Amino acid sequence: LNSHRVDPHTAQKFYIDGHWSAPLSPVSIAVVNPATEEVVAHVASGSAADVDRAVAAARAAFAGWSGTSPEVRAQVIGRIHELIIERKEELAQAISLEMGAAISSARAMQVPLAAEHVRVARDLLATYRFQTVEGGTAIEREPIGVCALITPWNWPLYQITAKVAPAIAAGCTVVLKPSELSPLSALLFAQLVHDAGLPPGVFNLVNGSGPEVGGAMAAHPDIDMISITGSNRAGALVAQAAAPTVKRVTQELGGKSPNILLPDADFANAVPPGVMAAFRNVGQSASAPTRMIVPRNRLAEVEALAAQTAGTIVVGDPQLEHTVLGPIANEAQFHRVQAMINAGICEGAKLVCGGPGRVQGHEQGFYTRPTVFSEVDSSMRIAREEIFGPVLCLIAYDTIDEAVAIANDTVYGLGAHVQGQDLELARSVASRIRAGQVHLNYPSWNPMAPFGGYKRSGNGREYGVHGFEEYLETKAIVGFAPADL
C-alpha cells in the first residue's frame, strides 16, 4: 500500500552545488522499512572528500546568497513552503516508509509541523531589523557563514526544516547530513528546494555515517558553525571535534521530561492526554513527558487510568489510516527500548501494563508494546535514562515542593508539563522547572516558542526568531555616527 518510490537516479547521489553528483566512494547504505524489516532502498555513504566538495560549494555560494536581499530570500523560502504543501502526501509516504510513522501521523503532523518552520522563517524576514542604531554605534546582524547540519530520524523532515529554514533565511549557506536511518525524505526535500529555485550551493546534501561524514563536518576548517540534533553521545563528540576551529556549536540532545499533575487537576481528564503525550511518535521524541509525577494518594487511580488509555492505542501497520502507533523506527532502537523495559522489570518497578516482546499479531516489524511502570523511584535506571520508546514512568509525591524536586531531579531539561486547575499555581510551578519549555494543561504546539534544553539537553534554541538568531553573528560599528565637539 505505501506508495513511495525512491528515485533510482538520485538514490545514491549527493546534492552538491545545484546538481546530483556521484559519491567519491562506492559504499552503500541499505534502508530498512521498520514495519516489515525489508531493505527498501540504498543510498550512498559519503567520505571526507565528499564533505569537502559540499563545503566548497557552500563557501562559493555564500557571497551571492548573503548578498541577496531579505525580501528576495523570503520569496525563495516562501516557494519552498508552497512545494512542501503541494508534495505533502509524497513526503508523508516516504517518512512512514523509512521510520515507520503511522501514515495518519505523517500527514497530520510529521509534514505540517515541518511546513510551519519554513512559514515562520519566511514571515520573519518581513520585520527583522538587521541593523540598529543606538547613537554613534550601530549593531548589524550578519549570517555566520557555512553551516553543518546533522539531524536524527524520529521527526526527519521536521528536524531538517527547523535548521535549514532559519539558516537559509539568515543568509547562511548549508551542508546537511540527514540520519542514515531516514534518508529517503531528505532525498525528496533536496529535490524540493531545487525545484523551489534555491541557488546552487546554498543547500547541500550528503549521506553517510555520523562518525565519518558528521566527523568530517565537525572538524572542517571552512565550516563556521555546526548544529546537531541527536544523542548526547554524538552531541559531545561533535563539540569536541569542533573545539579547535572554535565553531559555533548548537545542540539539541536528550530529555526526560516530567509531567506534574498538581493535586487540583482533573485526574480522569488529565492522565489520558499525558499518556498519549508520552507515547506520541511511539515515544520516539526527546521532549516527550515520560515521567508522570502525581500525588501518592492518587497513584492507584492514575495507574488504572494509564493502563486504560494505553490499552486502547491501536498499534499496527502504518499503511492503515486507523493505525495510531507504528513500529519502533529501526532494529537498533527496538533492541535498546527492549533492554530498558527489561531493566525496569529487573530493578523492581511495577509493570502496570505493556512489557517486553513484539506486539502480538505483528511479529514481523519492530512493533513494541506501550509500557507503563509505576511505584517508580527516581534512582531507577528507567527514571534517569531516556528510553526513546513508549515507556511511561509513574512517580509519587507527598508535597508540591517534593514534586518540583523530582521534576528537576535529572541531568536533562528539554521540556516539561504541568496539569492544574488553579492557573496561578500552575504558572508558579512552571517557572520552577529548569527546562526550556513548560506546557500548561496541554496547550497546542507553538512554532514561535523557543525550543531547547537547560543543563544537558543542549545549547542554543530553535524555532521562531530565537532559532533564526542562532545563525547570525553580532557586529558593533562604534563611531558609526561621529560624536559631539
Ligand X SMILES: NC(=O)c1ccc[n+]([C@@H]2O[C@H](COP(=O)([O-])OP(=O)(O)OC[C@H]3O[C@@H](n4cnc5c(N)ncnc54)[C@H](O)[C@@H]3O)[C@@H](O)[C@H]2O)c1
What does the buried/exposed string (b/e) look like for 368-382 if buried means 16 or more CB atoms within 10 Å of the residue's CB?
Answer: bbbbbbbbbeeebeb
Q: Tell me: does residue 445 bind ligand OYA (CB under 6 A).
A: yes
Q: Tell me: does residue 470 bind ligand X (CB under 6 A).
A: no
Is 151 annotated for ligand binding?
yes
Q: How far is the CB of 26 from ligand OYA (least distance, A)?
A: 34
177 binds, among its own copies, ligand OYA, ligand X, none (CB under 5 to 8 A by kind): ligand X
Q: Tell me: does residue 285 bind ligand OYA (CB under 6 A).
A: yes
Q: How far is the CB of 110 from ligand OYA (least distance, A)?
A: 9
Contact with its own copies (CB under 8 A) among 20, 403, 457, 471: 457
Cα separation, 307 vs 233, whole angstroms: 33
Q: Near ligand OYA by CB under 6 A, which window of 204-212, 279-287, 353-361, 405-413?
A: 279-287
Question: Amino acid identity, residue 137?
Answer: T
Chain residues 98-157 in contact with ligand X, contact rule CB under 6 A? 150-155
C-alpha of 406 from chain center: 25
Q: Tell me: does residue 289 bind ligand X (CB under 6 A).
A: no
Contact with ligand OYA (CB under 6 A) among 10, 173, 287, 374: 287
Q: Tell me: does residue 253 bind its own copies (CB under 8 A).
A: yes
What sign results for the dihedral spanned by CA atoms 298, 304, 307, 310?
negative
What sign results for the dihedral spanned by CA atoms 96, 102, 107, 109?
negative
Q: Which one, 374 or 437, has the nearer CB to ligand X?
A: 437
Q: How far is the CB of 129 from its own copies (least distance, A)?
A: 15
Phi, psi for residue 320 in degrees, rounded to 5 = -95, 135
Strand partners, 19: 16
Secondary structure (DSSP) of 223-234: --EEEEES-HHH
Cα separation, 240 vs 108, whole angstroms: 38
Grid cell digits, residue 183: 534518508
Looking up cell 545514491 gives 12
List Cα–Cα distances, 297 to 18, 175, 201, 425, in angstroms. Answer: 62, 53, 60, 20
Q: Which one, 63 or 339, has the nearer CB to its own copies?
A: 63
Cα separation, 54 vs 382, whole angstroms: 41
Contact with ligand OYA (CB under 6 A) among 44, 106, 206, 286: 286
Q: How many residues bind its own copies (CB under 8 A)?
A: 65
Grid cell digits, residue 372: 507503563
Chain residues 239-258 in contact with ligand X, contact rule CB under 6 A? 252-255
Cα separation, 40 vs 37, whole angstroms: 9
**Per-position x/- string for 96-135, each x denoting binding to ligand OYA as judged by CB under 6 A, each - no binding:** -----------------x----------------------
Measured between its terminal Cα atoms, the distance across the chain in Å is 78
Looking up cell 516558542 gives 449
Q: Which one, 341 or 403, has the nearer CB to ligand X?
A: 341
Alpha helix positions (H), 25-87: 48-66, 70-86
Q: Tell me: does residue 288 bind its own copies (CB under 8 A).
A: no
Query: What angle do the packed helices 70-86 and 88-99 form, to 10 degrees?
Result: 70
Please give the DSSP secondary-structure letter assigned to residue 153.
Answer: S
Q: Near its own copies by CB under 8 A, which window of 50-58, 105-113, 154-162, 434-442?
A: 434-442
Q: Tell me: does residue 452 bind its own copies (CB under 8 A).
A: yes
List Cα–Cα distances, 448 to 116, 189, 405, in angstroms. Answer: 10, 23, 29
Q: How many residues bind ligand OYA (CB under 6 A)?
A: 6
Provide the 3-class DSSP secondary structure of residue 37: coil
Q: Near ligand OYA by CB under 6 A, which window of 22-30, 129-137, 281-289, 314-322?
A: 281-289
Which residues are at the interface with ligand OYA (CB under 6 A)? 113, 155, 285-287, 445
Residues at the contact surface with its own copies, assessed by CB under 8 A:
134, 136-140, 142, 144, 224, 232, 235-237, 239-240, 242-246, 248-249, 251, 253, 423, 427, 430-431, 434-446, 448-459, 461, 466, 473-480, 482-483
Q: Provide the binding-site residues for ligand X, judged by CB under 6 A.
A: 150-155, 159, 177, 179-180, 210-211, 214-215, 218, 228-231, 234, 237-238, 252-255, 286, 386, 388, 414, 451, 458
As annotated, the binding site includes 151, 153, 177, 180, 231, 252-253, 386
Q: List binding-site positions for NAD(+).
A: 151, 153, 177, 180, 231, 252-253, 386
